[PDB]
Amino acid sequence: YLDRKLLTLEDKELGSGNFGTVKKGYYQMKVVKTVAVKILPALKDELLAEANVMQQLDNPYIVRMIGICEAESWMLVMEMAELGPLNKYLQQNRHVKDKNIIELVHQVSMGMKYLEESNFVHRDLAARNVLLVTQHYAKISDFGLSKALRADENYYKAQTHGKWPVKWYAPECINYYKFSSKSDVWSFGVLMWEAFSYGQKPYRGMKGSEVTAMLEKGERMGCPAGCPREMYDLMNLCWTYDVENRPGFAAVELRLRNYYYDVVN
């Protein structure tokens, strides 16, 4: 738990949604640290579960949680990623080099490799949820739909089909409500497309049911302009319909590791 007196909140609103709003601030530590504060019974239980997941995670490519504070509203204090979301940054900076995209995409795969090792499912892996510390440093955020996998289960089964980002979801998520690390691999493939399309929305002008109908026909999104063939090959590899033949984050990270080092050297 954190002290409200040490936490200094600013009027500058970073984000806004159904939960409430995300505002910029700075918490007084043992040197002051710039923070992004998520400001809010259903929403309160969600924020507490989101905090418990973030507390269990320790990786340089995962957004770090400072702690929780209860005052004017329930607050989730997390580290500030100055450059903001990946999709919005690329939308405002179309001149970003292809090598720089591979670098940031590989950083997400390293962070996702950790989540696979820690046996955690993200369930909301999109370009909007990838935050930039700098132009060459990316971190994974929004653990609101994230779940800690059971010791005996390799997947998370959801009872109800609530507010879900359909366009980033694997076929087993839509059809059987099953969420594994390989389901996040499919989401990573969509994330890759968004990154190489410079923050463009996937399956534009299409409805959730139309996306499902497209994927059943074996149809996948086209290669973005300027995106290398090897990176688009990995996208389709992530977009394998059957969960069994779809690669894990260890294989996806390695393919990205070897290709990024091939571009630089």
Q: Taking Cα atoms as reference points, which of 131, 127, 133, 207 lies closest to residue 174?
A: 207
Domain that holds residue 16: 1-80
Judge contact between 77 and 184, C-beta under 8 A.
no
Which pair of tokens denotes residue 237? 């590899």
Is 124 one of the annotated active-site residues of the chain? yes
Q: Which of 32, 65, 80 is the last residue of a domain?
A: 80
Candidate list 58, 124, 184, 262, residue with the active-site label: 124
Same-domain pairing of 164 and 114:
yes
Which pair of tokens denotes residue 242? 């059957």
- 14 labeled binding residue: yes
- 16 labeled binding residue: yes
Same-domain pairing of 187 and 88:
yes
The data reach a resolution, in angstroms, of 2.3
Judge contact between 18 and 40, C-beta under 8 A.
no
Same-domain pairing of 217 and 115:
yes
- 19 labeled binding residue: yes
- 181 labeled binding residue: no
Q: Which of 20, 45, 80 is the last residue of a domain?
A: 80
**Number of separate helices (H) and strands (E) present in the chain:** 8, 12
CATH number (domain holding residue 152)? 1.10.510.10
Same-domain pairing of 93 and 214:
yes
- 199 labeled binding residue: no
> How many whole angstroms separate alpha carbon 67 and alpha carbon 33?
13
Cα dist from 119 to 21, 40, 177, whole Å: 30, 28, 18
Q: How was this structure determined?
A: X-ray
Q: Which of 22, 45, 80 is the last residue of a domain?
A: 80
